[PDB]
Protein: protein (clathrin heavy chain)
Organism: Bos taurus
Amino acid sequence: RLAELEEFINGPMYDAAKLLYNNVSNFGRLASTLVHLGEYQAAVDGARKANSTRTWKEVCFACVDGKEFRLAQMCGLHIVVHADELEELINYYQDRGYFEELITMLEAALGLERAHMGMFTELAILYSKFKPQKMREHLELFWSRVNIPKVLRAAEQAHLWAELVFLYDKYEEYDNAIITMMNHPTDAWKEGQFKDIITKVANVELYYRAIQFYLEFKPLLLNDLLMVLSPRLDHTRAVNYFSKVKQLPLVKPYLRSVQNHNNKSVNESLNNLFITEEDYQALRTSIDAYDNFDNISLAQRLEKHELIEFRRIAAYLFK
């Protein structure tokens, strides 16, 4: 020990070289041997002085092997910042099965001034398959600083529907956000945002596919939803469906809201309602303001009605 301590340090083996490399100050191997000597905490000092990447990898990895984590962490925050290195560092903490610590480190890295995309993208991914509850609040803050396509394929695989919509939304892949809110309603579906995304949708067919969904599982919301679909909705096609599905009394609010298009199936459909609900004043106005309908059919149908207000209308229709 002191044998070479006062000899090499007098004038111009892991424990001997430890001193040798120490005076020449080749921290590259000073740190390397310190590890190879189980003197971890100090080896992280040599790696600091050595200020080398390939060097922190030797120390960090071994520091891991020795299951020294608070060390392997601060000794790992010097590597994550290096995109070209981020992967091997993760793939290493993975096979050693230390997924818990790997995600505890990245937790801090995020703070680092040199924190990049590859980090946020990788934390999300991990979070999905190891801490789903966090997966949300994470995208909530760093959805902009992450490779979206990869994070999606990662929630798709992790059935995190609520989040999937979030991103599909941000990534402006609206058709997908809707399709998703529609197959996994409990999770994803939210009344308000459905009425905001649906619009952006590209493939209009989804409207008719949504109408059906809302109609079969959410009746009270079908009208307010129809109101937003109006501009691009093929009303004749819409009314036909509701009619075949004998649901026209439910979409009344919508029918009135559209009738002003003097659409036929609309008037005919709308008029049948005023009739079954003995609303003759409303019927009068309808056959007065909008004329696209078969008056003789109506006329004939009404001339047989038991209510005088209607029989009078029939007469008016025939004239």
